[PDB]
Amino acid sequence: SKPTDRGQQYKDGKFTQPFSLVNQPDAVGAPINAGDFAEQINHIRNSSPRLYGNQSNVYNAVQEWLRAGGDTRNMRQFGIDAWQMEGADNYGNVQFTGYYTPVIQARHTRQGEFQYPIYRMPPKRGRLSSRAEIYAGALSDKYILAYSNSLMDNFIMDVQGSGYIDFGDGSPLNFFSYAGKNGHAYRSIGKVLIDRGEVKKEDMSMQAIRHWGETHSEAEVRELLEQNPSFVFFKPQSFAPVKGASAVPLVGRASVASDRSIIPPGTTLLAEVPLLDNNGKFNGQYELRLMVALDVGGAIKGQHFDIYQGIGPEAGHRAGWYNHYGRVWVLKTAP
Incomplete structure (x- = not known):
């Protein structure tokens, strides 16, 4: 009925559409990777100027929001709209897998x-x-x-x-x-x-x-x-350096592989990522991070995300070996 073994939560109601505009994301605090996010945006700026130019309004607003404190309760002050993804079960549980550079x-x-x-x-x-x-x-x-x-x-x-x-x-x-x-x-x-x-x-x-x-x-x-x-x-x-299909160098935990038709390259995501223990099992905790879709994968379709964990053994351990679930909000600005 409602399993929780893999990080699933059911406190955000039942979704009736792929993306739903929320007044405030159900996530407490501020993203923990502001520095990594900035580094990721800088890589887009230099490696994919066309993509940067098209999404700069969003990146700029997010950067302004972060420097001012980054708390999720203050996002609207910067014209940032948060669209929660319905995920794999229409309850907001977004399918997450991980990948890394061995x-x-x-x-x-x-x-x-x-x-x-x-x-x-x-x-x-x-x-x-x-x-x-x-x-x-x-x-x-x-x-x-x-x-x-x-x-x-x-x-x-x-x-x-x-x-x-x-x-x-x-x-x-x-x-x-x-x-x-x-x-x-x-x-x-x-x-x-x-x-x-x-x-x-x-x-x-x-x-x-x-x-x-x-x-x-x-x-x-x-x-x-x-x-x-x-x-x-x-x-x-x-x-x-390791780059995604977008030709932009990937920053560990600040980038994901996604389905182009659902989450276009350059899309900004605010995510509650499920953490794993030493056996690759959901440990009960989540991390609030900002990430950008900058890669694709042959079996990464729909609302499934493959988080790039980085390079080496530690990234390998964090990657996991089976499906886990978190929450994701697509961040955009309204003209």
Whole structure:
């Protein structure tokens, strides 16, 4: 009837439309990320001047409001309208998932836990080998770019097509991009997990696949991954800050991926974000933050938001691996 296990709340009435204008958002206090929000807007200003010009009236009003105190009760003084989203259940519970930029730990030689090679493009002959054959050592060692400490991390990098690598020697972060693919068509690992009853369809995502790997043995991970005979090859690439589809560098917890047809890029959002414990479970608390839609995702549709958590392990922990719920108000100004 009315579950609360994932952060759902029912104190804002029943919604009859996708967005509803409220006199004052049901959120106490001020956003906690004013600095990050400003930094995010500055990135839009410099990286996407066209988008900035079109939304500047909103950003300016929000900035003025924040400097004056940022309390949600004083938003109207600045012409800021708050449109509450009905969410996934028409009770205002907005579906939230998280994503982040992983930093793969790797070494130049195979040592200790680092035993999973990441490859550059081999000759056409070697490209014919399946993932299983490659895992078995079908390719020469001269094509190995690095030895990671996680087979699952390598796969997630395969799907993404690129990834950041830390060799642990204090040198600059390494970036590797898509160079090519092997001669085998890919198969969905997520579909395999869904068919096996291991992961729920609605909770399926790259993060969910990541969590499955963490809760399973090396043999089980390898067995699963081998169900996809495709394999990806990479090449060194000059470092570039993480950007969303909008081409704007993303600021952790100040940006989201959203459905363009519902929440256009550049849209300002005030959100009560559900916090998670060490097991990825809603811990009872929420954080009031401002965020801008600056990315998209293949499975991020409707009123579902994918919060960019940032880069590294901490961002990874905050990302979670299944659906959670918060409240969101789209901020706009009336002419």
